[PDB]
Design a protein around this ligand. Structure first.
Ligand SMILES: Cc1nc(N2CCC3(CC2)CO[C@@H](C)[C@H]3N)c(CO)nc1-c1cccc(Cl)c1Cl
Ligand SMILES: [Cl-]
Ligand SMILES: [Cl-]
Length: 501
């Protein structure tokens, strides 16, 4: 249900599409290809088309005149279910009818200009039973080919590849008989639910798109070069974004009245099924189990991804650090950037001692490095001296105000140190990573950390799959990794880490 995003459409084409193929209440979203992180929400209303700017510098989607969101799907879901909220001169703009895109570019199974010879090799060397892909036809421009692998996954002739010709006849697609579809996606979805059966009984099951993003770590440099050609990075990122509609999990607790002002941004909320639940709260507080934070479990180190504190959640943050036995905190922003508070100070001045509700914190020592400041903190519960433990706060301070670092070396040396600290502490809990809304830079640091932990343990003899890792983390907190710039930065960091092995 993300067909309303059109990756290769212009503003002219958007307007004409809404005016000729849509009605009042129709809408679509689209990127500004030249300006990264810029998107447009185009809506038809009163026979005219309004364009609404959406900006993402790396922390969240900022909708002009509206609110801030973790994903465009969560944005669209919000206004398709909360009417009268989106306003112009202040007139209400209704999102009623998604205008579905027919472009297959961002589909996981679509490989564009790929030859039949390449498609078979890939299916043979990387596929399994039910792996499939769609490519543009080499013989007849405008047509396509669906290639499917079937067989026994236990070479020896037990598996095969079957090619199915897809013709384009008067702007519709068909496999030679039966229904004619308005797009390749409709055709593929139809034959995923109703599989073609070959003469003699082979069921051409479309089980999963061919995995082409999982590569050996030594292949990363070549992949980055391919993805960098003028850009394969953009197509792969928007293919990942297309799948964000699978991740609209419930966030009911963060929407409760008692919890609304515990959120930095009211619509950027933790999934219920992975949120950190706080116990032992004040019995006189009706709802005391809430913080805008999620456990991120790789699927040996786990993380808590959370926002920068508010004045009224500092105490809850320390309750969380204590309860989860966290010993390492990563801050991803300065306290203040561009004159705006990005991470309120929740620790004492150096050598000072403060109580934060029932928790007591001493700042033992601060140490300055080039890219970050280390603060050695001692955390304990008031009245229970034997509960004291040291919490090492790594405050990354040189991330640019917009975009990403030009070189990943600083981030990598930082994560390397954080990793060694965590590993030195027996039975340490999850590493807390936070600031801002806790999804952009936070997701980027966490995904880099997960990937380099693989390489650190296994060296060059391991498979890396960047979008699979990101999708896995985004299923535990909304919108982890916000921008294509961060996406490329993750690749560049992995590549750099491998080179310095
Ligand atoms: C992001 C991604 N990209 C893939 N590629 C690369 C980009 C193309 C399609 C195939 C190739 O050509 C482009 C025009 C484009 N259509 C594949 C295939 O394995 N998977 C994923 C993936 C992986 C794990 C989790 C999730 Cl959620 C996803 Cl979406
Ligand atoms: Cl596969
Ligand atoms: Cl962040």
């Amino acid at each position: 249900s993300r067909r309303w995003f059109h990756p290769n459409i212009t503003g002219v084409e958007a307007e004409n599409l809404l005016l000729t193929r849509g009605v009042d209440g129709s809408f679509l979203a689209r990127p500004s290809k030249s300006n990264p992180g810029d998107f447009t929400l185009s809506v038809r209303r009163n026979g005219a088309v309004t364009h609404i700017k959406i900006q993402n510098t790396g922390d969240y989607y900022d909708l002009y005149g509206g609110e801030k969101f973790a994903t465009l799907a969560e944005l669209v879901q919000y206004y398709m279910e909360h009417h009268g909220q989106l306003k112009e001169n202040g007139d209400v703009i209704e999102l009623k009818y998604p205008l579905n895109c027919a472009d297959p570019t961002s589909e996981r199974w679509f490989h564009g200009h790929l030859s039949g010879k390449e498609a078979e090799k890939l299916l043979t060397e990387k596929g399994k039973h039910g792996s499939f892909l769609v490519r543009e036809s080499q013989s007849h421009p405008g047509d396509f080919v669906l290639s499917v692998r079937t067989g026994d996954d236990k070479n020896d002739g037990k598996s095969k590849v079957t090619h199915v010709m897809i013709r384009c006849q008067e702007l519709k697609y068909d496999v030679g008989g039966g229904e004619r579809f308005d797009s390749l996606t409709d055709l593929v979805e139809h034959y995923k639910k109703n599989p073609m059966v070959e003469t003699l009984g082979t069921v051409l099951q479309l089980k999963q798109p061919l995995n082409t993003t999982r590569i050996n770590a030594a292949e990363i440099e070549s992949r980055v070069r391919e993805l960098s050609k003028l850009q394969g990075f953009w197509e792969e990122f928007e293919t990942l974004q297309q799948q964000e509609c699978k991740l609209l999990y419930s966030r009911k607790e963060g929407q409760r009245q008692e919890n609304k002002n515990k959120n930095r941004y009211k619509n950027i909320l933790p999934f219920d099924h992975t949120r950190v639940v706080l116990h032992d709260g004040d019995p006189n507080e009706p709802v005391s189990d809430y913080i805008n934070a999620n456990i991120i479990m790789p699927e040996k180190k786990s993380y808590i991804a959370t926002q920068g504190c508010l004045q009224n959640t500092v105490n809850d943050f320390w309750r969380m650090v204590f309860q989860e036995n966290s010993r390492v905190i990563v801050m991803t922003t300065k306290e203040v950037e561009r004159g705006k508070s990005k991470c309120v100070k929740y620790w004492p001045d150096e050598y000072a001692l403060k109580e934060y509700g029932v928790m007591r914190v001493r700042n033992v020592k601060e140490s300055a490095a080039h890219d970050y400041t280390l603060r050695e903190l001692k955390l304990s519960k008031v009245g229970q001296g034997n509960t004291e433990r040291t919490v090492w706060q790594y405050h990354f301070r040189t991330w640019p105000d917009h975009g990403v670092p030009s070189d990943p070396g600083g981030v990598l040396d930082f994560l390397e140190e954080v990793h060694h600290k965590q590993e030195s502490i027996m039975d340490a809990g999850p590493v807390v990573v936070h600031c801002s809304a806790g999804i952009g830079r936070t997701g980027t640091f966490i995904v880099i950390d997960i990937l380099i932990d693989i390489i650190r343990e296994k060296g060059v003899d391991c498979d890396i799959d960047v979008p699979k890792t990101i999708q896995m983390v985004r299923s535990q907190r909304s919108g982890m990794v916000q921008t294509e710039a961060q996406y490329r930065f993750i690749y560049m960091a992995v590549q750099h880490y491998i080179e310095t092995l």
